Write a structure and sequence with these properties.
By secondary structure, the chain is α+β, with helices and mostly antiparallel strands. It has a single domain, classed as DD-peptidase/beta-lactamase superfamily (Beta-lactamase), CATH 3.40.710.10. The chain is built from 12 helices and 17 strands. The protein has a 10-stranded antiparallel sheet, with helices on both faces. A hairpin with a 2-residue loop joins strand 7 and strand 8. Helix 2 crosses helix 6 and helix 2 packs across helix 9. The longest helix has 18 residues. The two termini are 16 Å apart. It binds the ligand *[B]([O])([O])[C][N]S(=O)(=O)C1=[C][C]=C(C2=NN=N[N]2)[C]=C1Cl (2 copies). This is Beta-lactamase.
Amino acid sequence: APQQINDIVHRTITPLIEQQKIPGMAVAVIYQGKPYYFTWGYADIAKKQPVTQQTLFELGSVSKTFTGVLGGDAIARGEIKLSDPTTKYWPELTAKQWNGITLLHLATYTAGGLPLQVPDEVKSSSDLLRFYQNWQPAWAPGTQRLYANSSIGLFGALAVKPSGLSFEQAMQTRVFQPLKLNHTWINVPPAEEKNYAWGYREGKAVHVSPGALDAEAYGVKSTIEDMARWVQSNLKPLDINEKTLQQGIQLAQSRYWQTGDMYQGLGWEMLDWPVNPDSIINGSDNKIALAARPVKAITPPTPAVRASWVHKTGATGGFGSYVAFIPEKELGIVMLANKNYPNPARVDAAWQILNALQ
Ligand SMILES: *[B]([O])([O])[C][N]S(=O)(=O)C1=[C][C]=C(C2=NN=N[N]2)[C]=C1Cl
Ligand SMILES: O=S(=O)(NCB(O)O)c1ccc(-c2nnn[nH]2)cc1Cl
């Protein structure tokens, strides 16, 4: 715990916690590749349980980075290609709007206006087929980006079809286990419930609700130690012994589309480093992050650029997560909190910390 790391982390996060009234928080800084952990406050206010390095938080949409890497791994295995039509893996998707919509489009929110959320009324598998068959794109494929669980969530579900594994089985055996993420879960097992923090929304203790494509879009729970290891793995994929997983990580950080100063990967989003902090801080606000934006194709995609700010925000009703890292500098951060507090505050704090250490 080098004093410089201690000081910048505490001087940044303490006021953040006060300003945002965050009940509990865990932070990991990866510095020169090694992790340093910090915790504050409560995983469960009522039961007076502190946040520890073993507390599980809901990652919300940081889960999309696992989905993107799992899909990358499936590509590397030759099970799927991003150029494949969606209908190759879901032949029942016969409606004509699907002609020309590829796995790439699903993975990268560019299918033409798939919505942020699958409707809550979608309860059954037949309900889900009906939803996608009936959905009408606003835009031609590959022209506009609209951040969407219904897009990358469907990508994740289809990416694992050739394996014959469930999404959860595939994620466990192909991503979590090889990376030794032994406290990372799509479904929190009873054995780990003592460590599962409550989220807090309007003062009420809450956990994520079941929904269609939840696992694939926002359903992972993890500890600060596993998330630090996730950052390490994404910083230095060549250290990964499993070849297709190493390659999948590289594929998820490739740059497929550009909008403004941001590049869309598979789950991960990237900017060139050094970044303008106003560009990423303001860019993280949901006023921007969730907007419909024209995209420019990167033809062909640019392989993972080491001088990148690579990051992802995540939320559920009760939790707010953020991960960012810079491969060139072997530097990264994870911020896990059990309140869904504004994205710009997350990015500002992460940038203040990483810039001071870089
Ligand atoms: B990701 O950007 O974190 C997804 N964001 S979201 O707006 O689609 C979303 C989906 C589902 C939930 C949820 N909370 N509790 N049950 N479901 C929250 C959010 Cl924030
Ligand atoms: O041209 S690509 O951008 N295509 C991306 B893909 O098919 O999802 C590409 C990028 C990186 C790599 C790679 N493999 N191992 N190391 N880099 C391969 C491709 Cl095809």
